Design a protein around this ligand. Sequence first.
Ligand SMILES: Nc1ncnc2c1ncn2[C@@H]1O[C@H](COP(=O)(O)OP(=O)(O)O)[C@@H](O)[C@H]1O
Ligand SMILES: Nc1ncnc2c1ncn2[C@@H]1O[C@H](COP(=O)(O)OP(=O)(O)O)[C@@H](O)[C@H]1O
Ligand code: VO4
Ligand code: VO4
Ligand SMILES: [Mg+2]
Ligand SMILES: [Mg+2]
Lengths: 436, 436, 231, 231
Amino acid sequence: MRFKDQVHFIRRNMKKNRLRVFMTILATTMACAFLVVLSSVGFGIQKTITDMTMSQQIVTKVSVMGKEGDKPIKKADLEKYDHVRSVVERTQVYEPNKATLGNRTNESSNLIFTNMNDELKANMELEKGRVAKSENEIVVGYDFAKRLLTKKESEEYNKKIEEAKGNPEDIKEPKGYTKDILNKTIELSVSKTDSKTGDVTKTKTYDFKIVGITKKPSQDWMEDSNIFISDQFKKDFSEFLDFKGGNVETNIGVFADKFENVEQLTNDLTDDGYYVTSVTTELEGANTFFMVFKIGLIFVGCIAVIISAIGIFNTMTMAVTERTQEIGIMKAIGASPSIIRRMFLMESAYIGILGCVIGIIISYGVSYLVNLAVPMILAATSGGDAGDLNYTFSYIPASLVIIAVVICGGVAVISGMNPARKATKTNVLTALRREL
Amino acid sequence: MRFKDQVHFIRRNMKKNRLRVFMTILATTMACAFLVVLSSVGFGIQKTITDMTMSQQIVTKVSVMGKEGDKPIKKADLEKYDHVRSVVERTQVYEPNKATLGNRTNESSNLIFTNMNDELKANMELEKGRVAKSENEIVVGYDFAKRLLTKKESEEYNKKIEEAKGNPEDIKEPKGYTKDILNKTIELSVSKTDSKTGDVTKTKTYDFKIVGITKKPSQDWMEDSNIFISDQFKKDFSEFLDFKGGNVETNIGVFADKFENVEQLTNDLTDDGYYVTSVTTELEGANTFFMVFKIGLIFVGCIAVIISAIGIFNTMTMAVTERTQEIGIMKAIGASPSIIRRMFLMESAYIGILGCVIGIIISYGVSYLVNLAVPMILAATSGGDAGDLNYTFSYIPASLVIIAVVICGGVAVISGMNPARKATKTNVLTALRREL
Amino acid sequence: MIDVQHIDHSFTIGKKGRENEVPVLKDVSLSVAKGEIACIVGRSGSGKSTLLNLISGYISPTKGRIVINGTDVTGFNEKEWAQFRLDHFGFIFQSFQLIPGLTTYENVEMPLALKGIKPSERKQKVQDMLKRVGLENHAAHYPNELSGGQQQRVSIARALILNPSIILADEPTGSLDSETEHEVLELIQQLNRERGITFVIITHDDEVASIGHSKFQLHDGVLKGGITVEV
Amino acid sequence: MIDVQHIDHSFTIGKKGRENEVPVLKDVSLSVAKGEIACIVGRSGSGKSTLLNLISGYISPTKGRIVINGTDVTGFNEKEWAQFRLDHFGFIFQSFQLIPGLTTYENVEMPLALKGIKPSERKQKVQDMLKRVGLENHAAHYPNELSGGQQQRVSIARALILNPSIILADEPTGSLDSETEHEVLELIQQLNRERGITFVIITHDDEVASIGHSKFQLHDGVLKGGITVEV
Ligand SMILES: Nc1ncnc2c1ncn2[C@@H]1O[C@H](COP(=O)(O)OP(=O)(O)O)[C@@H](O)[C@H]1O
Ligand SMILES: Nc1ncnc2c1ncn2[C@@H]1O[C@H](COP(=O)(O)OP(=O)(O)O)[C@@H](O)[C@H]1O
Ligand code: VO4
Ligand code: VO4
Ligand SMILES: [Mg+2]
Ligand SMILES: [Mg+2]
C-alpha cells in the first residue's frame, strides 16, 4: 500500500530471485549497450564522412571547365544554384614574377587570383595558417618557401641541372627557405616585357604578407609553388598587365555544402549547359551508393531497435509471467490490481533504469576501448602507414543516449507491465493455478 | 526411457507451456533473423563495392603520368608490382584518319593503340559489345557512330557552325550513324603528309571490325570518338607520321585487383619514382576510411553476434531454470540425470532448430522485401535516377545461413543445457524447492 | 455472514474444440451467520475448495448469487473483489499459497502492509501472530525452508493477522499433528469468541468439524448441511 | 529394508556470512524390516519429511549412514541415487510434487516411461492404478484441475505404479476424507501383503498410524519410537 512498503517488498523479492532479476537487467543492459554502440559506430561513420567533406575539397568540388554555347562564365550566377557552399574562381597566371624575401628570390611561383572569402567558404586545404582575410594577406603553396633561392644556390642549381643532365633521378634540391615562411612579407615584382618595347619596362612591387600555406600536394612529385592573391588586386594587375589567353588558365570550382548534394548540383549545372566534372561524374552511381548506404544504416538501426526491444520483451515477459502465482496470492490477500500493477511498474522501471544505466556505462567504456583499439588495428594492418585520415570510429551523442535509454526503458516497462496487467485482470484462481 | 517416450513428454510439456516455448522460439528466431539480415546488409555492401570495383575501373586505376629521372616507362616492369590486375598503356595518336563505313566518313576519331588483353583484364568500360580479342577487331567510342557523316549533312554542319557567330548554343549536330555500329567493318585510312613532300603521299587502309563500344561518358559534352587498335598492329600506323611527341599522348594506367590494394600499389609505384595519381592520393585517407569501415563492419558483426547470443542465453536460461522443479521431480521419480539432460538437449535442439529455420525463412523474406523496397525508396527520395549503380542492398550467402544457424542453435543448446545440468547435478530437494 | 444462494459452478477443460464440462456444484446454498463457525465436510473432489473460491471471489459462479455481509459480491470486478477481501476476508489456502520470495515474517506481514498498518505496529502484530501459531523461531525461514504444517500455519497466520470478519479456511489443519492442530483450533475458537470472526472451515478431521456451530456436507456437488450443532 | 544409522541432519539458512544452523535430526536410527509398514508420527516440523528425504537421497545427511536393501546409499551421486530410486523407491510427496505440464494420466505414467515398460502395456497399468485411487474420471485433468486430495492420490498412484520395494509416503492421506483415506489405506495394505512392499509412512492420522506394524515417534529430532510387534 504505502510506497515504502511497495519498495520494501519489491526489494525483498528481488533479493530472493537474483537469477531472474539478473536476467532482466542483463537483457536491458545488453539492449541499451548494443543500441548505443551500434548507433555510435554509425555516428562515427557519419562524423568521419562529414570531416572528410570539410577537409578534402575534391569530395564536394564540381569543377566547371566551360559552357555550351561558349560564353564567359560568371561566378555570381553559379552561386544561385542551391546547396552551393562556395564558388572558387582561380585566375591562374603563368606570367613571370619576382617574389623576394630579401637575399633569396623566387621565379617559378605561379600567380593565382582568387576570392579569399570563397576559398575560406570552400574550406581551402591548408597545411598551416589560415586563409587570407584582408587584401594584402596571401596564401602560398607548400613548395613556395622551398623555391626561395639566393644567387649562390641558384648558380649551384643551374650547374647541377645543366652540367649533369643524363638521368635526373637524384639531384640535390636546395632546402630553400627552411625557416617559417608563415607570417612574413614578400615583394612581388612583375615585368611587362612585350614585343613593342622588347625589354623590361615600368615595374612595380607589392608587399604581400603570407598568412596561409596550402596543403602539401598528394605526392612528392607534385610541386605546389602557387601564390594566391585576392581578386581585389585583379583590377590593379589588369591596369598593370593584360592577362588574356596564352598564360591564363581559369579554374572554376563550385562547392556543395554536403556530398549528398553534389549529384543534384552537378545535374543542375549540367542541364544549364555547364561542362562540370564532380565526384558523381567520375564515379558513376556514387550518389546512389551513398544513398543505399544511408538507407542501410537506417535499416540496420531499425532492425537493431527491433532485436533489442524483442530481447527486452522476451526477458521481461518471461520474468513477469513467472510472477503470476504471486500476483494471484497478492490479489487473494487483498492487494488491489492497481497496487499490484504499480508495484510491477516500479519493478520494471527499476530494472529498465538500472539496465539502461549499466548499458550506457558499458557503451561509453566500449566506445572508449574501440576508439583506442581501431588505431591499433590500423597500425597493425597498415603495411606502410596507409593514408592520413581523421576518423571517428565510435561516437556517442547525448541524443543517442537519450533515445536508447527511452527505447530500452520503455520496452522494459511495457513488457514488464503487460503480463502483470493480464494477471491482475484474470480471476485469482486462474493466477493461483498459473493459468490453465 | 525410450526415445519415443522422451519425445512424447517433451511435446506434452511444450503443449502445456506455449508462452515459454514461444518465448524461446522467438528469441532464437529473432537472433537468427537479425544476424542473417544484418550480415546480409554487410554482404550486400561488400558485393556493391566489388561490383563498383569491377565496373568503374576508376576505383582501381593508378595512372602513371611520368617517372622521376626521365626514362621510357615500360609496361612489362609495371606488372611486376604486387596486386596489379592489369597495366593499360594507351598510345593516343591525334594524326589524321579516314575511318569510313561507306557513304559516310569519319575524321574526328582519335586512334588509340592499346593491348587488348590488358584492356580486357582492366575491365574496359563498354556500353555494348566486348573488348577486341583478335588482331583485326577494334573497340570504338560511344560517339564514333554519331560522327559517321557524309558530305550531305557535313555542308549543313559547316554552315551552321560558321553562322553561329559567337552563339553556338543552338547547333543541331547530325545524328550520324544511328544504326547498330557493332559487329560492322570500317576502312581506316592513314596518310603520310609530311613537309618534305607537302601533299598526300602513299596511303594504306585497313579493314577493322568493331566489336565493342566504350561506355557513354556521363554529363555529356564528352565526345568519345576514340578507336582502339591492338598493339600487335604497331608501326603500321607509325611508318605514316612517325611519333615525334608533338601530338602523340601516352596514357598509362596500372590497375589493381580490389580497391584495398590501390593504396599499397600507389605507394609501391611512388617509392619507385613513378608519378602516379590513383584514388588514394586524390582522396587523402581513402584506404584508411575503407579499412575503418571494414573494421566497423567486423565489430558490428561481432557485437551483433553478442547481442543475439545474449538474447538466446537469457531466454533459454530463464525457460530451463523454470523447469528446475520438474527436473527435481524427474530425478526423484527415478529419471537418470543423463536422461534428463538428453531430454533437455533434445528440447533445446528442437527450439534452436525451429527458431533457426523460422529465422532463416524470415531472413530470406526480409531480404527479398528490402531488395524490393530500396529501389522504391531510391525513386522516392532522389527522384528517378537509380539506374547507374547496380547495387545489392541485402545479400544472403549460404555460408552466412550456415554460420548463423550454427551460432544461434549452438547458443540455444548450450543455454538450455547449462541450467538443466545445474538442476540435475544438485540434490533432488534443492530442485524440488527451486533452490534455497 | 455468508449467503451462497443456488450456486451452480462448472469448469471447462480440454483443448480448443473438444471441451468438457466438469459440473462441480449444483444448487449449492450455504448460509453462515455472523460470528459462527461453519464446517464443510465432504469427499475429496466434492467441490468444497470450489465453494470457498466462489465465496472469496477467486472464481465467478456459473450461475447463482453470493451475498457477503449483505452486499452482492457476484459481479464484482477484480478491484472490487480485492478491496472486499482486504476489508473482510482472510483465506487459509489448501496449498498454503505462500509467496516464495518472502520469509515467514514477510508473508504474514504482507496483508498488514496492504492495509497500511505502520511497520512499527506491524512488528508486534506479526510477532504475536507467529507465536500464536508456534512459528516464533521460523520467522526468518522462507516457505521452502519450512515443513508442510509450518507453511500451513504461515497461511493461517497470514489469514488471521488482520482479524477479518470472515476467515475461509481450506483444510487448515491437514498438515498438523494433534497438538498443533489443537492449538490452531483453540486460536480459531478464541478469535470466533472474542473478535466474532465468522469461519467457514473445510476439513477432513472430525475434531475440527466438531468445533463448528454448523456442519455442511458436500456430496456430488450438493450441500446438504442444514444442521446447526449446539456445540 | 531401511537401515538409518545415527543420522544427524542440519540445514544452513540465512544471508552469506550470517548463516545459522537448523538442527533437525539428532542420532536418528530407523530400522524397517522387509515387507513392514513403519509409521513415523511426530509434531509438525520435527524432521519427518527430512528423514524421508534422507532415506530417498533427496538430501545427504550431515552425518550418519543410510543402508537400503543392504547397500550403503550415502555417498551415492545423483546418477546412482536416481537409478536406485527407479529400481526400489516410490515416493509420495507431502506437496504431491506433480508435474504441471502433464495430465493425471501422464503423471502416473511417467515412472513407467522411465522404466521403459511399453507404451501399450502402460495403458492398462495407469488405468488400473487410477481406478484404485478413484481417479478414473480425472485422467485428462492437469494438477491445476484437481483437488488437493486428488493431487495427493495422483502422487500415490505415481509412487505405487511401479510396485517398488519401498514406498516412502509423506503424509499420504492428509488431503483425503475418511472414505478415500480408507480406500488408500486398504490399497497400501494390499500392496504390503501381496507384493511385500515396505512402507515408511509419515502421518498425523491415528488410523493411518494404526495400520503400521511399526510406530516411530519423532520428537526434538529423536526417533524414539522403537515399536515392532506381531500382527
Ligand atoms: N481448474 C479446474 N478445472 C477443472 N476441474 C477442476 C478445477 N479445479 C477443480 N476441479 C475439479 O472440481 C472438483 C471439485 O474440486 P475441489 O473443490 O478442488 O475439491 P475439494 O472438494 O476436495 O476441495 C474436483 O473433482 C476437481 O477435479
Ligand atoms: N530447506 C530447509 N532449510 C532450513 N530448514 C528447513 C528446511 N526444510 C525444513 N526445514 C526445517 O526442518 C524442520 C523439520 O522439517 P520437516 O522434516 O520438513 O518437517 P516435518 O517433520 O513436519 O515433515 C522444520 O522446523 C523446518 O523448519
Ligand atoms: O510436514 V509437517 O509440518 O506436516 O509434519
Ligand atoms: O481433495 V480435497 O481438496 O477435499 O482435499
Ligand atoms: Mg480442496
Ligand atoms: Mg513434512
